[PDB]
Amino acid sequence: MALGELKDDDFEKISELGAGNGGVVFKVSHKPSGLVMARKLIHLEIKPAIRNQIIRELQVLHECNSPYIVGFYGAFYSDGEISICMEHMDGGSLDQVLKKAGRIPEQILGKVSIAVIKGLTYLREKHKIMHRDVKPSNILVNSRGEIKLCDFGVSGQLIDEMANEGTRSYMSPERLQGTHYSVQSDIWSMGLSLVEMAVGRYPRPPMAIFELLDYIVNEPPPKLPSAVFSLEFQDFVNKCLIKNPAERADLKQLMVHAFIKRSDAEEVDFAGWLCSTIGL
Ligand SMILES: Nc1ncnc2c1ncn2[C@@H]1O[C@H](COP(=O)(O)OP(=O)(O)OP(=O)(O)O)[C@@H](O)[C@H]1O
Ligand SMILES: O=C(NOC[C@@H](O)CO)c1ccc(F)c(F)c1Nc1ccc(I)cc1F
Numbered sequence: 001m002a003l004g005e006l007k008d009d010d011f012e013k014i015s016e017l018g019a020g021n022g023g024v025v026f027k028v029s030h031k032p033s034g035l036v037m038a039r040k041l042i043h044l045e046i047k048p049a050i051r052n053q054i055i056r057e058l059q060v061l062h063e064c065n066s067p068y069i070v071g072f073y074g075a076f077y078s079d080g081e082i083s084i085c086m087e088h089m090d091g092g093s094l095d096q097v098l099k100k101a102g103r104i105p106e107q108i109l110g111k112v113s114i115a116v117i118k119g120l121t122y123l124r125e126k127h128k129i130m131h132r133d134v135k136p137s138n139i140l141v142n143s144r145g146e147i148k149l150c151d152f153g154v155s156g157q158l159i160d161e162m163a164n165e166g167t168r169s170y171m172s173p174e175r176l177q178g179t180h181y182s183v184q185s186d187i188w189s190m191g192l193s194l195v196e197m198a199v200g201r202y203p204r205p206p207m208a209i210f211e212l213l214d215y216i217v218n219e220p221p222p223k224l225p226s227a228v229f230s231l232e233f234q235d236f237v238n239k240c241l242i243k244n245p246a247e248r249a250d251l252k253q254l255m256v257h258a259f260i261k262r263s264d265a266e267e268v269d270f271a272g273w274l275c276s277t278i279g280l
């Protein structure tokens with residue numbers, strides 16, 4: 001097919017695009033094709049059987065086709081690590097962006113809201129995929145002003161192997177109390193992403209981890225400063241963060257919210273905003 005059998009020898013490392021919990025990501029040249037990719041190495045110590053079922057489950061990403069979903073090129077195993085080769089987003093994640101910007105303005109975050117809502121509507125409706133880890137380091141951006149999701153849970157096995165070797169500060173209250181994952185949880189992590197990027201920091205009083213986890217279950221959700229953000233943005237984020245998942249807005253409902261309709265209509269030169277702030 002398009003790329004054939006992908007192997008470690010074909011790739012030359014260009015730079016390192018960063019690291020997180022359990023994996024490193026490099027910008028690479030797939031030399032035979034001339035493709036520039038992002039290569040992400042994942043160390044899992046797993047019985048061969050279980051690894052191959054991951055790499056096969058990962059092939060469902062070849063069928064993922066959305067302007068709001070990072071593109072997939074392949075997935076192989078070499079030397080204890082699974083490689084997931086993907087489209088290289090040249091603006092990095094909103095995480096790295098927020099470090100540089102300090103705060104991301106509301107108007108830009110309305111473009112992210114739209115891209116995030118549409119990305120997730122795509123997964124749910126086309127592929128019956130829930131994201132499972134919406135947060136700003138898994139929302140990625142490029143010099144073409146594009147905004148895309150990665151790191152969603154296509155693979156059941158990888159979900160399982162990941163849960164037992166996460167980002168608990170980003171899980172909704174009900175998920176924290178041990179409930180099975182739902183779309184309404186993608187939405188909380190959306191809400192929470194939008195408030196963190198807006199205010200410039202993880203939007204909870206500082207505390208020890210186990211305290212934070214009960215804090216989230218027990219205490220009322222975060223909110224925007226009312227002074228410096230439109231009422232429609234405050235509503236939008238509030239509806240994403242209702243603690244009862246039954247009463248939280250769903251994606252249908254968010255897509256026609258005052259703040260989304262307002263932002264859709266706006267003309268934001270997000271690409272130039274970006275290239276300005278990260279020196280691209
Ligand atoms: N396709 C890509 N293009 C450009 N940069 C990427 C891509 N995928 C990941 N990165 C960068 O690599 C980093 C590593 O992401 P990874 O999924 O390795 O961890 P994370 O999401 O940052 O954190 P965690 O592991 O704690 O969830 C990200 O911060 C992002 O900057
Ligand atoms: O990589 C993922 N999480 O990473 C967190 C970090 O601790 C390790 O990097 C991850 C988790 C579950 C799953 F099903 C995936 F497919 C993942 N990878 C993944 C998914 C879609 C694209 I387009 C590109 C990708 F790479």
Ligand SMILES: [Mg+2]
Pocket residue numbers: 020137138151
């Ligand atoms: Mg990531």
